[PDB]
Design a protein around this ligand. Structure first.
Ligand SMILES: [Mg+2]
Ligand SMILES: [Mg+2]
Ligand SMILES: [Mg+2]
Ligand SMILES: [Mg+2]
Ligand SMILES: [Mg+2]
Ligand SMILES: [Mg+2]
Ligand SMILES: [Mg+2]
Ligand SMILES: [Mg+2]
Ligand SMILES: [Mg+2]
Ligand SMILES: [Mg+2]
Ligand SMILES: [Mg+2]
Ligand SMILES: [Mg+2]
Ligand SMILES: [Mg+2]
Ligand SMILES: [Mg+2]
Ligand SMILES: [Mg+2]
Ligand SMILES: [Mg+2]
Ligand SMILES: [Mg+2]
Ligand SMILES: [Mg+2]
Ligand SMILES: [Mg+2]
Ligand SMILES: [Mg+2]
Ligand SMILES: [Mg+2]
Ligand SMILES: [Mg+2]
Ligand SMILES: [Mg+2]
Ligand SMILES: [Mg+2]
Ligand SMILES: [Mg+2]
Ligand SMILES: [Mg+2]
Ligand SMILES: [Mg+2]
Ligand SMILES: [Mg+2]
Ligand SMILES: [Mg+2]
Ligand SMILES: [Mg+2]
Ligand SMILES: [Mg+2]
Ligand SMILES: [Mg+2]
Ligand SMILES: [Mg+2]
Ligand SMILES: [Mg+2]
Ligand SMILES: [Mg+2]
Ligand SMILES: [Mg+2]
Ligand SMILES: [Mg+2]
Ligand SMILES: [Mg+2]
Ligand SMILES: [Mg+2]
Ligand SMILES: [Mg+2]
Ligand SMILES: [Mg+2]
Ligand SMILES: [Mg+2]
Ligand SMILES: [Mg+2]
Ligand SMILES: [Mg+2]
Ligand SMILES: [Mg+2]
Ligand SMILES: [Zn+2]
Lengths: 59, 220, 95, 74
RNA sequence: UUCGGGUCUUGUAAUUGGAAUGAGUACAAUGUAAAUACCUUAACGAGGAACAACUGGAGGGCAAGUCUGGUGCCAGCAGCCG
RNA sequence: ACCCACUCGGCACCUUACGAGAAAUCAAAGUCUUUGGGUUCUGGGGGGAGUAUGGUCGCAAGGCUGAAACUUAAAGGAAUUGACGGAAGGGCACCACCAGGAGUGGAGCCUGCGGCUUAAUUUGACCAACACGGGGAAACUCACCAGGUCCAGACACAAUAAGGAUUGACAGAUUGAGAGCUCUUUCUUGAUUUUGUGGGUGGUGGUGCAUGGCCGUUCUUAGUUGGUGGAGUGAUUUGUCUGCUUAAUUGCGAUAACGAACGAGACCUUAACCUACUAAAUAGGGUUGCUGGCACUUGCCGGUUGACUCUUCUUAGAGGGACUAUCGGUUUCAAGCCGAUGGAAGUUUGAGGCAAUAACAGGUCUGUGAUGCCCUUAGACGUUCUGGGCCGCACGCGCGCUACACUGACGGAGCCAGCGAGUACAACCUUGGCCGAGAGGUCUGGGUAAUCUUGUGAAACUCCGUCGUGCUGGGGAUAGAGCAUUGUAAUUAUUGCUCUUCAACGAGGAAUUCCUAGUAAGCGCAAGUCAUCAGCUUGCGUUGAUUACGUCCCUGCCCUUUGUACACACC
RNA sequence: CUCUAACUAUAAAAAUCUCUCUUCUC
């Protein structure tokens, strides 16, 4: 939520974060945080919205 | 923090201009409150307590879509209570909207005396009761310093009210916290709904604050 | 292909004579023991068995009437038992 | 899934070839000629230069430094 | 000016000191029909003050652990849900 | 007999909550925590059980009265959201059908599974597994098997130890080895090492039911979502709908809903059309040269990197173009549908690319130096070398290929494309000239590419002949022999070529697959696999149709209504 | 501000299903 708040503070017209994995439980689950609006179809998906994927190692 | 609060309601405009000084003016003329910032302005010290968080599920074709119901009680322990009940996706948002509703639904209560009057009122004025669902709550005046003889949720509601001594009796499925708290809220707000001999003489019907100060509303 | 497990310090083999209901079986243990066999853990609804199936079963030293069936052999490890011959060979169980 | 068993070997063992250490090895290579001149019991290798001693095993002499290219019958 | 004196206090450390005291023993005397015992009191009687506080529980109801090792729907736990 | 008004009594009814209820609902089920008009009967969780017993009534059937022992954590009521219905309404889909076409299933073979077999025949998938893991593996690949090597065990400490911690080896035994792997002997080497402890690495080892990422599927359908506001005590609901329209939650609208967000659409790529612009020896054309031939009239078909000129085609940039444009019907006359005309184009213009919320215990640890945990970590599940296997074969199944011939096979002759690709620190695409009958060989020359292969002179196809209904000149499987190519290596035939034997096969049961226009189908070519190998896939083009232009009958999908004792949801 | 008219007409068969349920706190 801090990341989303900072991003929307930067002037972005919408931010979204997916955190998938073992969030404090053995069974896997994905949490979705969003604000604003994110398009999904047509090169507007390439022209405006930029994405990033990362892996984080925990214990 | 950051708060501008452009007022969208005439009541909100009057409050922001500083023309309504006490919440008693709001309660007296039965004014409709739709901006929580009015209640924040009038009662700076409204404490809260999240009574319960309850997961409620809806069965759709794919999995079970789960939200959370927050039961928030707001008040100042000086004769003002509100009971917000909200449902939302994220628990924090649920609690925020629940306190928000609770502030919107503030209500005054009529604390009285069990026997002779010596100091400030310590208990309710008369016996009162409310009923939500199948839960019926009966509040009965108690002698001074008898504590709040009530279940923990109702006890916390009375503590937020400012009622220091009161007896209670609940009938039904008082298990469900929302029903019990709503019934107790109905009773404690009904305390100002009982005509009493000391409340018989008629008054002069002082003009409404938005009639005398209509000019300061209507943003031009 | 899995390794076949032999008996040890109390467990013994047997053959199902007739399978009862409610997870119960009649099993002839090869000591002349027409014992009652209880379907047990890891064996409830994960592996299925039937009439005339080679079986391995653990005894209960505090009650010899009933005994708890543990592992079932798939009619080929049964053949291996049959050649190594730890069980009596006076019985024919074929297909 | 994989079902692996403990490996069984039809070979007793192959043991690490331990180097044959020799105490006082160097002096056996030489011979003191009575407080003065000294000689060498082993033969010198021509390809490497002075000092390196030939290896005599049986009806030939063998080198150590250029070992591979020198094995000359006695 | 980073500090920082700790300027003012409150805990944690097998460091470290001096006190006080019984629970026990016991001259007596009181007590009692006679004795115990209690009240009083000589003389002893605390350093790990070994003069050593247990009984249940730590998912919820219900205060308190999603620490470590063991067993892996066994052994067992569980008033109920588990 | 009606009509109007009123009243008493009765079966009833509509609206509403301002009252009551857990609600469905009730004008009584109201006047009940602000609890008392009179009065009778009945119930105290479910089951056992309205059972036994004892009475009593009855001809009998059976009625009335009527427990316990024991067992159980629930049984049950109303309603909400889903799912389901051999329930209803309205719409859709050649992964549905109708009308059809081509088929598969019958035969050979090729490949992939299962089973069997084996030392191993390594393994993961069982609509959404099965020509799938780019899985066309002779070595490698590799993961399996019989064996043989090595540490590529950092680092810290201890320990030996510089009068040797150690390393390596000629030659022989040993080995498959020209392996100092192990031994015989001896020689070489210098603090890197060696043997113990901790620890660390490596692992196509296990767990996709611990995970990420990605992809597939639910679902190619049109469906989702929250903010104020309304209704509910509430789970939830309205907004998201009575209609009509659309491919569409697409719009016209009506409205306790108002404004919005994602999806759809829009958007990009591609395919058209551009005698309008910019231009071009890496594309074409004209005129004229310099020539060749034939005609003889000045003309025809050619060659030339000689000159001048142009951009119609070929290119690729900026742009234009279609927005259902005009007109006629039909439509609460609105959204829109149908037809004709003009057009290049009137199915969203065709074809695609991205493609929402929620989810699957769908697949992948075997793509990853992505990875938690567990296992192993020295004769190793690490790594490498040799050889074998992944291809075996009493048997079933799934993609396909070649065929059963006359609309044909075989000879000649005609001669037509579009996607590609192509060599450097390596050796690619190959023209052309000589050889060979062919595969192929050799000598040269282009091309790091609109330049050269290349106009890829491809097959089907076309013309003229041979064959003549004969399992035949169809079919080309199975074999024998030989010649070559790639390869360290070709046997268990890599592949190509030459001669011969020429098998099953007579249009294929039940059943089942794909598809509505340059589509299906026939035909091949290029690219990815590639040192050599496709019967595979991804693309491209040639010839090019029959039959629809509809429906909910089978299989499903979307919305609404209804019922449910279902929610691990009709498996 | 005056008004009661049009219509039909489908019932063949279809039984059963072994797991396993997992925390919401700013
Ligand atoms: Mg959009
Ligand atoms: Mg789109
Ligand atoms: Mg049982
Ligand atoms: Mg204890
Ligand atoms: Mg315990
Ligand atoms: Mg414990
Ligand atoms: Mg607690
Ligand atoms: Mg009962
Ligand atoms: Mg009953
Ligand atoms: Mg009787
Ligand atoms: Mg019900
Ligand atoms: Mg089908
Ligand atoms: Mg058909
Ligand atoms: Mg065919
Ligand atoms: Mg076939
Ligand atoms: Mg077949
Ligand atoms: Mg196999
Ligand atoms: Mg599908
Ligand atoms: Mg091959
Ligand atoms: Mg190998
Ligand atoms: Mg191999
Ligand atoms: Mg080996
Ligand atoms: Mg690996
Ligand atoms: Mg390996
Ligand atoms: Mg999975
Ligand atoms: Mg989707
Ligand atoms: Mg709302
Ligand atoms: Mg809705
Ligand atoms: Mg042009
Ligand atoms: Mg018109
Ligand atoms: Mg399209
Ligand atoms: Mg799975
Ligand atoms: Mg691994
Ligand atoms: Mg294979
Ligand atoms: Mg396939
Ligand atoms: Mg021909
Ligand atoms: Mg071409
Ligand atoms: Mg040709
Ligand atoms: Mg023939
Ligand atoms: Mg032929
Ligand atoms: Mg053909
Ligand atoms: Mg392939
Ligand atoms: Mg159609
Ligand atoms: Mg249920
Ligand atoms: Mg059924
Ligand atoms: Zn030498």
């Amino acid at each position: 939520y801090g990341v989303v708040r900072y991003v929307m503070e930067s002037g972005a017209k919408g931010c979204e974060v997916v955190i998938s994995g073992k969030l404090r439980a053995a069974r896997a689950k994905s949490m979705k945080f969003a604000d604003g609006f994110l398009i999904h179809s047509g090169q507007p998906v390439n022209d405006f919205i930029e994405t990033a994927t990362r892996h984080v190692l925990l214990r | 923090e950051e708060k501008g609060w452009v007022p969208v309601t005439k009541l909100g405009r009057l409050v922001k201009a500083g023309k309504i000084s006490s919440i008693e003016e709001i309660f007296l003329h039965s004014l409709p409150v739709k901006e929580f910032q009015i209640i924040d302005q009038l009662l700076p010290n409204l404490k809260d307590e999240v009574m319960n968080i309850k997961p409620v599920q809806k069965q759709t074709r794919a999995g079970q879509r789960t939200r959370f119901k927050a039961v928030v009680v707001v008040g100042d322990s000086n004769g003002h209570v509100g009971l917000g009940i909200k449902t939302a996706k994220e628990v924090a948002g649920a609690i925020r909207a629940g306190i928000i509703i609770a502030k919107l639904s503030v209500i005054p209560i009529r604390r009285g005396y069990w026997g002779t009057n010596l100091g400030q009122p310590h208990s309710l004025a008369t016996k009162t009761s409310g009923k939500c669902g199948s839960v019926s709550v009966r509040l009965i005046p108690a002698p001074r310093g008898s504590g709040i003889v009530a279940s923990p949720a109702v006890k916390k509601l009375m503590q937020l009210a400012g009622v220091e001594d009161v007896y209670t009796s609940s009938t039904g499925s008082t298990r469900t916290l929302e029903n019990t708290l709503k019934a107790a809220f109905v009773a404690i707000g009904n305390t100002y709904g009982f005509l009493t001999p000391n409340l018989w003489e008629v008054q002069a019907l002082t003009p409404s604050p938005m009639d005398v100060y209509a000019d300061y509303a209507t943003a031009s | 292909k899995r390794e076949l497990i032999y008996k040890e310090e109390g467990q013994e083999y047997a053959q199902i004579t007739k399978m009862l209901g409610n997870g119960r079986v009649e099993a002839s243990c090869f000591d002349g023991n027409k014992r009652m066999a209880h379907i047990r853990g890891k064996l409830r609804k994960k592996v299925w068995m039937g009439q005339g199936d080679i079986i391995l079963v653990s005894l209960r030293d505090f009650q010899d009437d009933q005994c708890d069936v543990v592992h079932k052999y798939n009619l080929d490890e049964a053949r291996t038992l049959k050649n190594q011959g730890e069980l009596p060979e006076n019985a024919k169980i074929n297909e | 899934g994989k079902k692996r068993k403990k490996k069984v070997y039809t070979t007793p063992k192959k043991i690490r070839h331990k180097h044959k250490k020799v105490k006082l090895a160097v002096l056996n290579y030489y011979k003191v000629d009575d407080e003065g001149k000294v000689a060498k019991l082993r033969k010198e290798c021509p390809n490497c230069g002075p000092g390196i001693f030939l290896a005599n095993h049986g009806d030939r002499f063998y080198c150590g430094k250029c070992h591979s290219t020198f094995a000359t019958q006695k």
